[PDB]
């Protein structure tokens, strides 16, 4: 029992973690994004 | 009188009319020693129209002559097309002689008002196990397909086609498609071999034309099948029509095509700022008015195998009912490759498929959502760290899930078994019986492409 | 007046053109110094053109003049063993062409009602796709892969494979190095396979017009036997070079852009193109020979090659290209470096055409054996979090797995059709349920060597003869049983 | 009460007249002045005060205060809240109800996600029971 | 016949010169009164010209007069080049004096022909044994430098420049615009005092400089090294060159940078460029000829997860080999610092070098990733735990990383050894002995920069 | 010895300036010119020889060699040093010091994380002790 108690714990700290990382590399992805579809957009502004 | 044109680019051509005789909107224009006609688009003054070229572009300068019919493009509608297959404008391509007709209707109408407007009372029975289950038909309905390419649209609508609208009373059925000459050309042998043909008109157009026939072709079908539902004969008031059309997408892209030419901003994922109205005034028109009734099926392409991009998703809304086809169930082997999720219809009603058949629906439903949440314990936590509840719902989910694959009498092509064609209440006894917990035993292999519950019980023997 | 005019803009390849009021849509013009040119449009007062050849001897204020034709391309059997640029003019040296017969570049396909269904087979030479993925005269099967994953090997096999198919062969290469192009003649000459194969070049260093021009004149080419009731075949090495050329020559002629960069129509110029590769009926051969030969009907089948961006199968061209063809044969970069050599993805690779395009015995004994592979694939990657196993699921897990270590085959080793047909009976009657998973191919190899050792004319009957009867069943039934004893591996 | 059962259809239709008016572009082709549009409408559904409605009656009615209810409808594709419209009018109205595709098909019918919804005014707008 | 400027916007200088003589594409002007030169990118009609300033770009304004040379730049070839340092018009900065050299060459010329392509492909044999066996290079291939800061990327650079000489008898030309890291004594010193500097041309540039300058540098070599080349022994054979055309810059301008090498501009220039007649042209430039080859070596900066497959592969794909550098190797006195295992080379193929080598090859890969599994076992515990069959090749591996192993001559400084010169023969027959375990009795350290296994040998008996 | 308080902040000015003058935005957060922005300022900081001192003042100073250092300050958002900007300043100078922030509010009150920190020349610039 005391032995799935820690490895059970370990387990939740590393997904708390992992969770955190993510969520970074998601703004970013999210911020980057935006900024390409304005670029695109702006080319269409131009095309005429 | 007579114009004369300054401009083309690509499919584009600009024409310069005099002040007093400038034509008016959609309005057909013969260029005189060729087979091109222009439809326009835009009057951008100055006596000036944008137009697109109702063909293709071959041998075309400036400062060639055109003349103007004052009227949009008309086609010949009447019992004369049955039997017949025929280009965007309306000539035959069958190489069987001119169709003998005196009628003709405009391409471009508009749409039944609110006050002329019906309701659909009556179901639809097709023989598949998971349409006829999760999403009722009824007739003067609508249903939707959407997939992504190579998932198996085609081989459902032909499946479609041979279940209900073979032999019907009538049914005087229409069949405006584009797509691939291949199977093309193996439908039209196909049919004349039955001797459907007699009562069915086919409208046709490659996929090599220059946009501007792919951009007009649907209207061509919309405008033959209004006749067939509103024609009245002794008071027969005509005979329920039935309507494929297999080329939506083509009018969207051809749209897109031509949007930048025509010199208008673009607009999301460079798509039309005008997608929206285009898809409306397409849409409205397909539907079944007090004076008769139109039963149609729709083939939707997905681009990218995402539902939320902005035309697939512009399309939910006209829909009622919708049958969404799902890569991962295509590679994982089971055909017809339907998502049990995100698939309903508006007649899924306790009040119009009755008791059984919604509870049925709902706890098949439920089953599967369930199972759906516990992939991601199974993927961390061993399998027998699940509760006993949950390992009698993922394995009565995999029976199920398997339970939804038949095979159809179109494929036999790819595979050499015979078709089957279950009854609804089959069905209904089958899943009845299986979320009950009977069946149990019998191993989750035999559930795969073997019609009703009987041929289950037999397989069972061998594997 | 109306038919010459002065140049007003050099740059990048472009040229704008004053006057030629009398012009006409893809006409040729030509220029001062033996350079031609095509017109792609006519505004209000210009003329826009692109340049076939070298744009920097050209300067503002020369002349040009229209021709009154349209691209034409020399065209016949005298251009077998051949290799030549996108206009037809020799680059091997081997002397000039004497040419017979010119052939427009750009025309239209033949209507719904001048075709047939395809019901004959082509060979290439690999056991997982003339299996899974048939090939037939007329079909337009299309290739898809990552960079470095054997795109090339195996059209250069296809090519190969038809040495006594008595079917001609076309291919054509846009955007590539001279070494690469070069590499590739060599090998070809060195197999015997350049007796009945031309070669189109439209290298790097060559404008980009010529890489925009290549797969239409090499189709051209090809459709001369399609026309007189014989079959070609046509490889278009890269068209997604194609369409990054076209995208330049498009904006530079001050086109709107559009996603991804891309103007309009590229779906209508990848789409113009591979509606020319079809099957034609009869009637259509006798109308067009006047007569001169009956009883006959063409093909041309065609086998483009699109590459992916780290396995991007999402965007514009990838997607566009896709819902044009009849299939596609898939290939991973993750399979290529685990080992398998033709790392083709069963489940996501798919043939429309079906068992149509087989021969009897090979449509009767792999019936099916695609979808055990794909079902195969979920059932091996859910197993693995499951405590147990029925008898059901374990016969299941080794049959895949040996099905999928069978299919693996070494470059420029053609299987003919009796040894495909006896490893698919081999598979199917389940003979190698008790063969180690390792040591597959070695076994498998060896069978063949046996039944080429003796049996010789059994194995000639089927490789002339597609066809099985029972007495054609049990002497390989009986063959293999006894190659099971009395042997060693 | 009022109800509008999609705004986002509205904001299409105005982007789509925007831009072919030749308004300047922005994030998803939205025009600039898209946050006031919905502002401007959100903004009148109001309680007005018993003074308010005896001016405006000019005395006709005396004691009575009127009121406006407002039930604006949202559509978000799956399930991406951090859109441009959607945030626009989160950010304007008094509260949120949230329904989810996962609730609907599991079996809870009404669907209402109780965790992420909330009502500003709260409890002063019940009764005593 | 004279023009006058009209418009100066960042690098472009439009001038408009008369109707009768206008300045084809890429010919040469000069600004009267002003050190400035211009070069015409593209032509613009009304005798207007657009160009980029080549000269010092001080005192420049509207209106100045500009005289035409009727000639691309022309750029001095020769033997005479030989340990001189030059800026990209040519002229001499390292105040030694003139340039004997009378003969010029234009920079921009057409690329070979088909006819004139290799008969087969062939393989460059250079000084260091580690390329030669794990990523050997070819005549008219590409190589990229993939490593960091830390290693100075440098000493295998003279090592290279010594070997070609060395050996196949090759000159090389260097030609850089920058330096991103001046840690190490600059290249021209480092040349100087190795003795290396009578067999290099160089080419330089600073970022402080018209940005015309900057772009072009490549261009100026490249005609430098063509020259090399062609020119032919009494026997009438060519010579091989190395371009040392190192990575300007960071990916933020290489990759629009390292694309310059291939003829675009790194958002240098804003107004229209003419650089794709020079993309491909500039690449197909560097092959194998009949008489001779042009063999470019390109470094790289990475800062980490951007290099080989998981690199954005605008750089990437045209490289036809990949040498890595490790920043753990270097740190664990092993030089050269060339990581085997991150190291590829699209020339390690059976049909190409032969069986044998690709057979010894791929071996030795598979022992290092077999050790680097291992190594946490190993630092677990030691041989002790370990079982037999792995000590072995933890052994071998050993033995294998310190054979890895040479001395360099460009070192004679420090060295008491003149360095080793291994033929690739010697280097094949030496790990094919070493991995049939013959050798396994040999004590350890003796394969540490001992060079040739031959040389360790002697080594081991001696010690 | 010169110090530049923060080059991010003239990265941001620039941008601002290059956006005002209607350059194209580009698919990246800053312009790619900003690059060389970074570079022409950083080339000037170098140590002339003994020769050039004499040539450039005509023999009025000899024996003497002169220098110039730079100190420039670049921050980050969220320790994130692969973005456009710090990955640019990196590869351009000869050594860095990496400043972390969990160092600092863990007692440790000059925060410089020797793991990553690197000068690249070693000895030659320290004195004998
Ligand atoms: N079936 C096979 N068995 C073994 N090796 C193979 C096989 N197919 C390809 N290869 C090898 O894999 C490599 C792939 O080369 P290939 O020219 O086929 O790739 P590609 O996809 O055309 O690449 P590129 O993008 O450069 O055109 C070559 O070294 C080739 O010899
Ligand atoms: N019931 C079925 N049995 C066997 N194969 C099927 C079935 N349904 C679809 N397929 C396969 O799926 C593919 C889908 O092709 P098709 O429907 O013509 O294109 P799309 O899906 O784009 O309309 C076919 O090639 C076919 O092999
Ligand atoms: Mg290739």
Redesign the interface.
């Known amino acids: 029992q005391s032995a799935r108690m820690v490895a059970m714990k370990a387990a939740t700290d590393n997904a708390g973690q992992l969770i955190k990382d993510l969520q970074l590399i998601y703004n970013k992805l999210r911020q980057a994004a935006i900024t390409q579809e304005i670029s695109?957009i702006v080319?269409?502004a131009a095309?005429? | 009188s007579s114009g004369r044109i300054?401009?083309?680019?690509?499919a584009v051509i600009d024409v310069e009319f005099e002040r007093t005789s400038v034509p008016k909107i959609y309005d057909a224009l013969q260029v005189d020693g060729t087979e091109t006609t222009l439809e326009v688009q835009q009057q951008l003054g100055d006596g000036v129209v944008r137009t697109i070229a109702m063909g293709?572009?071959?041998?075309?300068?400036?400062?060639l002559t055109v003349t103007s019919t004052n009227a949009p493009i008309s086609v010949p509608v009447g019992t004369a097309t049955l039997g017949r297959?025929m280009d965007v404008l309306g000539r035959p391509?069958?190489?069987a002689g001119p169709v003998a007709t005196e009628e003709r209707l405009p391409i471009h109408r508009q749409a039944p008002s609110y006050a002329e407007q019906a309701a659909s009372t009556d179901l639809l029975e097709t023989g598949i196990k998971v349409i006829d289950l999760l999403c009722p038909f009824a007739k003067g309905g609508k249903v939707g397909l959407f997939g992504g390419?190579?998932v198996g649209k085609t081989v459902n609508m032909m499946e479609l086609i041979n279940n209900i609208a073979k032999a019907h009373s009538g049914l005087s059925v229409f069949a405006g498609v584009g797509e691939?000459?291949?199977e093309?050309?193996?439908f039209?042998?196909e049919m004349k071999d039955s001797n459907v043909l007699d009562k069915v008109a086919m409208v046709?157009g490659?996929?090599?034309e220059?946009?501007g026939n792919r951009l007009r072709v649907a209207l061509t079908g919309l405008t033959m099948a209004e006749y067939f539902r509103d024609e009245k004969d002794e008071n027969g008031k005509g005979r329920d029509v039935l309507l494929f059309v297999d080329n939506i997408y083509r009018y969207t892209?051809a749209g897109?095509?031509?949007s930048?030419?025509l010199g208008r901003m673009?607009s999301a994922?460079?798509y039309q700022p005008t997608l929206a109205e285009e898809m409306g005034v397409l849409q409205e028109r397909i539907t079944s008015t007090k004076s008769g009734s139109i039963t149609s099926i729709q083939a939707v392409?997905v681009?990218?195998?995402?539902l939320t991009d902005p035309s697939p998703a512009t399309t939910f809304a006209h829909l009622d009912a919708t049958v969404v086809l799902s890569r991962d169930i295509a590679?994982?082997?089971i055909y017809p490759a339907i998502d049990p999720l995100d698939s309903t219809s508006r007649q899924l009603d306790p009040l119009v498929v009755g008791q059984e058949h919604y509870e049925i629906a709902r706890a098949v439903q439920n089953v599967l959502q369930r199972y759906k949440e516990l992939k991601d314990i199974?993927?961390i936590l061993?399998?027998?760290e699940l509760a006993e509840e949950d390992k009698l719902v993922v394995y009565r989910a995999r029976k199920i899930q398997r339970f939804f694959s038949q095979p159809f009498h179109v494929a036999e092509?790819?595979?050499?078994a015979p078709g089957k064609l279950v009854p609804l209440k089959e069905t209904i006894r089958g899943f009845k019986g299986l979320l009950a917990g009977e069946y149990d035993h019998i191993?989750e292999?035999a559930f795969?492409m073997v019609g009703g519950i009987d041929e289950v019980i037999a397989k069972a023997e061998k594997? | 007046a109306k038919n010459e005019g002065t140049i007003?803009?050099?740059?990048?390849?472009i040229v704008?053109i004053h006057g030629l009021?009398?012009?006409?849509?893809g006409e040729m013009i030509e220029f001062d110094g033996g350079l031609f040119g095509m017109a792609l449009?006519?505004?209000?007062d210009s003329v826009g053109a692109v340049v076939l050849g070298?744009?920097?001897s050209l300067?503002?204020?020369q002349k040009a003049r229209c021709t009154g034709r349209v691209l034409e391309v020399p065209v016949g059997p005298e251009l077998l063993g051949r290799?030549v640029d996108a206009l037809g003019n020799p680059?091997?040296?081997k002397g000039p062409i004497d040419a017979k017969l010119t052939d427009a570049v750009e025309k239209?396909?033949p209507?719904?009602?001048w075709?047939?269904?395809?019901d004959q087979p082509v060979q290439t030479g690999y056991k997982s796709v003339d299996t899974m993925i048939p090939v037939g005269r007329?079909?337009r099967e299309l290739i898809i892969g990552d960079?470095?994953t054997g795109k090339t090997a195996m059209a250069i096999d296809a090519i190969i494979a038809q040495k006594n198919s008595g079917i001609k062969c076309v291919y054509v290469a846009i955007?590539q190095?001279?070494?690469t192009?070069?590499?590739v003649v060599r090998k070809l000459e060195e197999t015997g396979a350049m007796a009945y194969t031309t070669v189109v070049?439209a290298?790097?260093?060559?404008?980009?017009a010529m890489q925009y021009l290549a797969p239409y004149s090499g189709c051209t080419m090809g459709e001369y036997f399609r026309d007189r009731g014989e079959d070609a075949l046509i490889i278009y090495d890269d068209l997604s070079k194609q369409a990054v050329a076209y995208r330049?020559i498009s904006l530079?002629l001050r086109?709107?852009?559009?996603?991804?960069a891309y103007?309009?129509?590229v779906?209508?110029l990848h789409?113009?193109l591979l509606?020319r590769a079809?099957r034609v009926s009869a009637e259509y051969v006798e109308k067009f020979t006047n007569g001169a030969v009956t009883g006959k009907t063409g093909s041309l089948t065609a086998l483009p090659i699109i590459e992916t961006?780290?396995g991007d199968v999402?965007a514009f061209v990838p997607?566009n290209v896709?819902?044009?063809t009849?299939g596609?044969i898939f290939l991973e970069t993750s399979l290529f470096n685990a080992g398998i050599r033709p790392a083709v993805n069963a489940?996501?690779s798919?043939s429309?055409?079906?068992?149509?395009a087989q021969t009897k015995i090979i449509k009767k004994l792999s019936?099916?054996i695609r979808?055990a592979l794909?079902?195969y694939?979920?059932l091996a990657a859910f197993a693995q979090?499951?405590?147990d196993l029925?008898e059901?699921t374990r016969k299941?897990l080794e049959h895949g797995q040996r099905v999928t270590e069978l299919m693996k085959q070494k470059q420029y080793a053609p299987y003919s059709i009796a040894d495909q047909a006896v490893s698919v009976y081999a598979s199917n009657e389940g003979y190698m349920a008790d063969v180690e998973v390792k040591k597959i191919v070695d076994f498998d190899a060896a069978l063949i060597a046996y039944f080429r050792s003796e049996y010789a004319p059994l194995m000639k009957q089927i490789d002339e003869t597609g066809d099985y009867n029972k007495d054609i069943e049990a002497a390989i039934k009986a063959g293999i049983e006894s190659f099971k004893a009395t042997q060693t591996y």
């Open positions: 695109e080319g269409g095309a005429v | 300054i401009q083309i680019i690509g293709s572009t071959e041998g075309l300068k400036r400062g297959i391509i069958d190489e390419a190579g691939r000459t291949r093309g050309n193996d039209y042998h046709y490659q996929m090599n220059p946009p892209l897109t095509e031509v930048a030419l673009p994922v460079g392409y681009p990218a195998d995402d590679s994982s082997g199974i993927a061993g399998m027998d092509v790819f595979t050499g191993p292999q795969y594997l | 007003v803009m050099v740059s990048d390849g704008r009021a009398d012009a006409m849509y449009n006519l505004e209000q070298n744009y920097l300067q503002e204020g290799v680059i091997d040296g239209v396909a209507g719904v009602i075709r047939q269904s395809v007329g079909q960079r470095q955007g190095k001279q070494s192009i070069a590499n070049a290298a790097a260093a060559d404008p980009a330049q530079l086109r709107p852009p559009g996603r991804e103007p309009g129509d779906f209508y789409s113009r509606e079809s961006q780290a999402s997607t896709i819902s044009i009849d596609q489940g996501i798919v429309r055409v079906g068992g149509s019936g099916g979808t794909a079902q694939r979920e979090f499951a405590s029925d059901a299941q």
